[PDB]
Amino acid sequence: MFENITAAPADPILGLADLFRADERPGKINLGIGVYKDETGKTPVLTSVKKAEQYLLENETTKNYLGIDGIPEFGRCTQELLFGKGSALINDKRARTAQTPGGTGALRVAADFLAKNTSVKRVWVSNPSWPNHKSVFNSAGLEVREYAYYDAENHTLDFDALINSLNEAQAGDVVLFHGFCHNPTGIDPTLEQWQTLAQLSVEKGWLPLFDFAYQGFARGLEEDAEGLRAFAAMHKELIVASSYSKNFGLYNERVGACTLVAADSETVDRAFSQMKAAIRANYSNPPAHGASVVATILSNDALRAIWEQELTDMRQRIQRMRQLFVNTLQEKGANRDFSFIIKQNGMFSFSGLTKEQVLRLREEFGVYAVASGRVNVAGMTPDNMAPLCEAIVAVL
Amino acid sequence: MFENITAAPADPILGLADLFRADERPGKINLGIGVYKDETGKTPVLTSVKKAEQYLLENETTKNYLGIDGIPEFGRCTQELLFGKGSALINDKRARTAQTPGGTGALRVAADFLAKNTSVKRVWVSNPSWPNHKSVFNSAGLEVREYAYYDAENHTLDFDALINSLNEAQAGDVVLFHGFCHNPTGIDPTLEQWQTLAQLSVEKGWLPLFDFAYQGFARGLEEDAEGLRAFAAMHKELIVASSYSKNFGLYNERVGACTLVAADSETVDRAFSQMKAAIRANYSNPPAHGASVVATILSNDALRAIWEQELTDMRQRIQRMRQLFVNTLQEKGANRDFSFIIKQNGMFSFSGLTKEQVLRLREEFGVYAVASGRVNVAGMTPDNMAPLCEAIVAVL
Numbered sequence: 168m169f170e171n172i173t174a175a176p177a178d179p180i181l182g183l184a185d186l187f188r189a190d191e192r193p194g195k196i197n198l199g200i201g202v203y204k205d206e207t208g209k210t211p212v213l214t215s216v217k218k219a220e221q222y223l224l225e226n227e228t229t230k231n232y233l234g235i236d237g238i239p240e241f242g243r244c245t246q247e248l249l250f251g252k253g254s255a256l257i258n259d260k261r262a263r264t265a266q267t268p269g270g271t272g273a274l275r276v277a278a279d280f281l282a283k284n285t286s287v288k289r290v291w292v293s294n295p296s297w298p299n300h301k302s303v304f305n306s307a308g309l310e311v312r313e314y315a316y317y318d319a320e321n322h323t324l325d326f327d328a329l330i331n332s333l334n335e336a337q338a339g340d341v342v343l344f345h346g347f348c349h350n351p352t353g354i355d356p357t358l359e360q361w362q363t364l365a366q367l368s369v370e371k372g373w374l375p376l377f378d379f380a381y382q383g384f385a386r387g388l389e390e391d392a393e394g395l396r397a398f399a400a401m402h403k404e405l406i407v408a409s410s411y412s413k414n415f416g417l418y419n420e421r422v423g424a425c426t427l428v429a430a431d432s433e434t435v436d437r438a439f440s441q442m443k444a445a446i447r448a449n450y451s452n453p454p455a456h457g458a459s460v461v462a463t464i465l466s467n468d469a470l471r472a473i474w475e476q477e478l479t480d481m482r483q484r485i486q487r488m489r490q491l492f493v494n495t496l497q498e499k500g501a502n503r504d505f506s507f508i509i510k511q512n513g514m515f516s517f518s519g520l521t522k523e524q525v526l527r528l529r530e531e532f533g534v535y536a537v538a539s540g541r542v543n544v545a546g547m548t549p550d551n552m553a554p555l556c557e558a559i560v561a562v563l
Numbered sequence: 564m565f566e567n568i569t570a571a572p573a574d575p576i577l578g579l580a581d582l583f584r585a586d587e588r589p590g591k592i593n594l595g596i597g598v599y600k601d602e603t604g605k606t607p608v609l610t611s612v613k614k615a616e617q618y619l620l621e622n623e624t625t626k627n628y629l630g631i632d633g634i635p636e637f638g639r640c641t642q643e644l645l646f647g648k649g650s651a652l653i654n655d656k657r658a659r660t661a662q663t664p665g666g667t668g669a670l671r672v673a674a675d676f677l678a679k680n681t682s683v684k685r686v687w688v689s690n691p692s693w694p695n696h697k698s699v700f701n702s703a704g705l706e707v708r709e710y711a712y713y714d715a716e717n718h719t720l721d722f723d724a725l726i727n728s729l730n731e732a733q734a735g736d737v738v739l740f741h742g743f744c745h746n747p748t749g750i751d752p753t754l755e756q757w758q759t760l761a762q763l764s765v766e767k768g769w770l771p772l773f774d775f776a777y778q779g780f781a782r783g784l785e786e787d788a789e790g791l792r793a794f795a796a797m798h799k800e801l802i803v804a805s806s807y808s809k810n811f812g813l814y815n816e817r818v819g820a821c822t823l824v825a826a827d828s829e830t831v832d833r834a835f836s837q838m839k840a841a842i843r844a845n846y847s848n849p850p851a852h853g854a855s856v857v858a859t860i861l862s863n864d865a866l867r868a869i870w871e872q873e874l875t876d877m878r879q880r881i882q883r884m885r886q887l888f889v890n891t892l893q894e895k896g897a898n899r900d901f902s903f904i905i906k907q908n909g910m911f912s913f914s915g916l917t918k919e920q921v922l923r924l925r926e927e928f929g930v931y932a933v934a935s936g937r938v939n940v941a942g943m944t945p946d947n948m949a950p951l952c953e954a955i956v957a958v959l
């Protein structure tokens with residue numbers, strides 16, 4: 168039965184890690200996968216997280232199955248982070264949240280639900296986008312269409328092109344929007360641009376689906392949720408696939424959420440029963456550990472205060488690395504103005520390196536970046552900044 | 564978009580828990596979901612598990628993403644449990660294991676992989692079977708066909724009917740076999756019957772898919788794997804979806820495995836690359852906590868010794884409850900001979916109660932059982948045995 172099975176091409180992000188962990192070379196630098204590193208080049212378990220885990224170890228009395236939608240408190244805390252504490256969506260019981268195995272699991276659950284319960288057949292994703300988006304949607308049997316986004320020449324959000332591209336999207340089509348810290352460009356719409364997009368989708372009949380993976384990494388928790396909230400104020404329906412992998416440094420525990428919003432309480436509940444059915448036929452119910460850690464921290468004032476500071480430190484360190492990256496490049500003889508990098512939000516810098524330069528950095532210098540030229544600024548430290556900038560000027 | 568979405572019917576197993584947790588009645592008894600309870604009616608975290616968690620809390624230095632297939636040691640330990648320590652399958656590198664979110668996640672991953680990479684269109688499941696089987700396979704777009712199994716009159720495995728039913732399965736069809744402790748009947752083939760089935764599937768060209776969820780609950784770890792091993796000795800290809808939810812009492816951490824076996828090392832690796840692609844488009848990579856607990860316990864002699872004893876205690880307690888159940892029923896005036904129950908393996912007793920009796924037990928007596936008449940013997944204790952047996956004799 169498996170004789171003719173052709174091997175899958177390696178994942179552009181995840182396969183990079185296999186390569187790097189096989190490179191016998193001593194001074195290799197990993198700027199591939201979107202994982203935070205501290206000044207020492209380590210990815211530590213957050214202190215707030217270690218504290219919550221100790222608490223769980225002392226307080227858990229059972230590992231009995233959670234419900235299909237997970238820990239209730241987790242869902243409540245998630246809605247407040249997304250929409251705001253006194254949100255009308257929350258007060259009108261218009262939103263239902265399912266705890267899922269990461270943000271990826273949330274996108275897959277949303278896709279399956281949409282494919283099997285609605286008339287949706289097409290999902291619009293930005294060009295460029297997180298490589299795994301197409302893959303998740305195609306799995307559920309939906310086709311992926313692209314909308315213009317990045318102006319590679321001016322390293323800018325090409326808003327008119329974005330608008331003109333989306334005019335091809337029909338009423339009933341899903342349009343995927345990144346929450347903030349656009350992966351891979353780091354270029355996000357201004358609040359006005361978000362308001363324009365919100366009235367446009369309400370006018371064109373699009374169903375918005377948000378991929379919210381970096382809340383807290385651009386400006387702050389509440390600020391980073393602005394575009395999404397601008398949308399929630401005017402849409403009767405929307406879906407948010409959020410992740411706690413990066414903002415809680417809980418990558419391997421798989422902590423995410425799929426939030427479904429409908430016009431009213433009764434509609435959302437009916438719709439949510441089908442989402443739960445899609446979950447039961449996939450992984451049954453979600454993993455307790457990471458979500459439990461998130462609920463514990465968000466529910467405890469002291470733990471929350473510590474976590475928020477840790478997130479603030481991650482955000483600030485990336486900002487310092489960005490500045491450092493463009494200065495050192497300038498000092499190392501890089502003749503291009505890489506100043507645009509200072510303008511990007513989040514962990515990633517879309518460098519503008521070509522496929523071959525990215526390939527050469529790897530083969531000749533052991534510097535690993537994604538083939539698209541996306542480099543993880545959070546993987547940079549003052550110690551590896553110089554050899555890294557030396558490698559880059561050499562391939563230009 | 565969601566206005567016409569019809570509500571899903573509640574899950575026959577999982578929805579039962581919502582009901583029970585809403586029943587204001589004081590003496591309700593839960594014999595629904597397949598979760599172990601100790602003599603006090605609690606589902607404690609195993610001691611071996613608590614010990615491994617303490618160890619992880621002290622020793623983990625990062626929550627960095629695992630690879631798509633999970634913790635390597637977890638996969639190795641899984642193959643030894645399944646096939647045996649000195650297995651040729653292991654020595655010839657013919658098997659590849661992906662750590663998955665529970666046994667359900669493993670079945671879904673196997674389904675997606677089969678749907679997208681092979682010529683398979685039909686999966687055969689026993690009548691009766693775990694209610695969620697049809698649901699998982701239909702999700703991947705495969706159709707489910709049934710094969711005869713249980714003789715309700717003689718409370719026996721109707722082997723000739725099983726054989727005659729499967730003669731309708733074509734070469735290239737998948738035939739799902741339960742490992743041991745058949746859910747829901749508790750009736751399993753003898754070792755000879757397993758050998759007969761193994762030569763028959765090799766002759767008919769069927770691809771065997773095992774749902775192995777109760778290793779350790781019938782007779783022991785190695786004994787419970789007999790039928791599967793009889794199959795592995797003669798098949799070039801097979802898939803095993805195993806679960807650690809029940810034997811490690813790790814229900815909510817979602818710990819399972821999907822093991823792919825091919826004719827050789829190179830074929831299995833090619834085939835596994837596609838399975839990994841199916842995982843990446845679903846939940847990306849697996850949750851670390853529970854699998855890490857399993858790898859820690861299985862890799863440590865002291866922790867393993869403790870775990871094995873705990874599993875032995877669970878097995879023995881269920882055996883005592885079975886005897887107790889049939890005696891008390893006999894004492895309480897139940898006129899049917901329920902002695903057949905003594906012959907069933909695992910947590911479940913297929914009682915023979917009709918849909919209406921099951922419904923009445925619930926509405927009038929607060930005794931919750933699955934509509935099929937499946938009752939969780941592991942949910943019984945000496946304290947609730949009498950009121951439970953009283954309720955049953957009253958609906959007969």
Ligand SMILES: *Cc1c(COP(=O)(O)O)cnc(C)c1O
Pocket residue numbers: 201268269270271272297345350378379380410411412418422423846847
């Ligand atoms: C990281 C990420 C995800 C999801 O990651 P999970 O690790 O599955 O939580 C989804 N979308 C974007 C844009 C991301 O960066």
Ligand SMILES: *Cc1c(COP(=O)(O)O)cnc(C)c1O
Pocket residue numbers: 450451597664665666667668693741746774775776806807808814818819
């Ligand atoms: C419990 C069970 C499963 C899977 O359960 P998970 O909790 O998803 O690990 C699969 N098959 C059978 C027969 C089971 O009893």
